[PDB]
């Protein structure tokens, strides 16, 4: 019957900066709160047990504290290895988690558009791919226009983890149409909106050129 309210759900900081995520328990829970770190693709790792106790084999920069109804996990000087998701645990109840990544100077995406292969067209389907390369922050908006007509519902996208070295994200967006529908239009374009872009960038092509 207890509720764990964690915050913030996301945050960015520079190398060496201080980071603090907090948990709020709907009821008094003493020190029965554990903290975990989870890196992409891997099992979670226990960082702090019983609220304050730093687990063994865990960097000194990690620190947890609190009692009763208020808790927080802190990282003295954020390092590159600390890019992961962090969450609290109260018995079988988990906090919502907090994604943290390295903060860097805004970087505009390098945008590319690829038309469908002649091979795939024979298969009856047409995939148009739009690549956004090496940008930050991760937040970008990809918009498909077919004959200058905004598309929605026939597109999926995928994003890499933050690259360790340059701290940037890459994103891939795919527009999938039937062959017949694809041959019914000329101009295929993806419009990209990002913070590092003074004005939305549009890459495009005409079918059959």
């Amino acid at each position: 019957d207890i509720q764990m309210t964690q915050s913030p759900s996301s945050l960015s900081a520079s190398l060496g900066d201080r980071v603090t995520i907090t948990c709020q328990a709907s009821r008094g829970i003493g020190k029965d709160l554990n903290w975990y770190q989870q890196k992409a693709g891997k099992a979670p790792k226990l960082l702090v047990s019983d609220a304050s106790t730093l687990e063994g084999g865990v960097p000194s920069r990690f620190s947890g504290s609190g009692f009763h109804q208020d808790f927080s996990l802190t990282i003295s000087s954020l390092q590159a290895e600390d890019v992961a998701t962090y969450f609290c645990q109260q018995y079988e109840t988990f906090g919502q988690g907090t994604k943290v990544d390295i903060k860097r100077t805004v970087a505009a995406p390098s945008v590319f558009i690829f038309p469908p292969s002649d091979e795939q067209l024979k298969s009856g389907t047409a995939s148009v791919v739009c690549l956004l390369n090496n940008f930050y922050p991760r937040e970008a908006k990809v918009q498909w226009k077919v004959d200058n007509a905004l598309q929605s519902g026939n597109s999926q996208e995928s994003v890499t983890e933050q690259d360790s070295k340059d701290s940037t994200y890459s994103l891939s967006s795919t527009l999938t149409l039937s062959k017949a529908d694809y041959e019914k239009h000329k101009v295929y374009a993806c419009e990209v909106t990002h913070q590092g872009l003074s004005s939305p960038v549009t890459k495009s092509f005409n079918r059959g050129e």
């Binding site: 019957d1 207890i2 029965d32 018995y91 079988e92 109840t93």
Partner: protein, 344 residues
Amino acid sequence: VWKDADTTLFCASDAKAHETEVHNVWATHACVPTDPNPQEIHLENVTENFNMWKNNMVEQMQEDVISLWDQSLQPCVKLTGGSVIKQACPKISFDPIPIHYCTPAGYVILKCNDKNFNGTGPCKNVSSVQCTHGIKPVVSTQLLLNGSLAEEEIIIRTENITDNAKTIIVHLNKSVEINCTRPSNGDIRKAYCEINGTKWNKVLKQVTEKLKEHFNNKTIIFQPPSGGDLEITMHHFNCRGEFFYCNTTQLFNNTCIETMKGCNGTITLPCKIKQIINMWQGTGQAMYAPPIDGKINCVSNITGILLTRDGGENNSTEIFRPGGGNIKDNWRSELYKYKVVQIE
């Protein structure tokens, strides 16, 4: 003045040195005679903190019962991870006697006297004694047998009531008899336990009332165990040296907690005497000879219940299932009101 401390206790009992019954034999060489004139002193305006869940007296009693069973029980075969040990397996005489735990010089036992003390926290009515009361080392699951009763109201004990991995001990304030019988010359392993249903259902209803106090006011539901070895999915205990396993499905029955016909009256639990058991010491499997002939009968007082509560977020109801398996909890149910301190 004193401070919390651990030390080596010794046990005392009224064992008969001429008896062949195995508890008497153990206590005769392992304990000293009981103190004829035990002294209890009430400490005025003393408030002290007790914690039944972290009380080293429990580990010490556990060592004693393990060694009592190791030298008393005579299985035909013990199987331990690979080694098979075969030996003579004559039937024994078996009936637990009360054991007292006692501090050596320089130490004393503090005793909590608050009627509704739940096992942890401040006690306001404290006294010091040289020895605990007499505690029968009864090994059982699901139901605590032949123990002491809570003084006033039914008590619920847990280290953390909201931790589903923690056992819950229900301390009854009125005993319910359970009368178990393997009748004399059907199948020789088949037995039954009889319980006064009228009396048991009233008590279970009071337990739910008390459980409700700890979980808002949610609906309280009993269910049979979700799984595990037969020693824990059934009410397991030794009677006259035989290992009984009794099905308790009928005992934790929720319709009887309104007037549906047949709630009152005698409840008959089906039981089996097993020759092949898992040893509660935790040392593997053991095999015994078939049961002795004739009537095999054990009348015991139910004085407590071991429960486990279902995990997972639930806002409507709480589900409890009979539990046990960690025999240390049996001792905790009796040692909860004692702690050892060192005299400064």
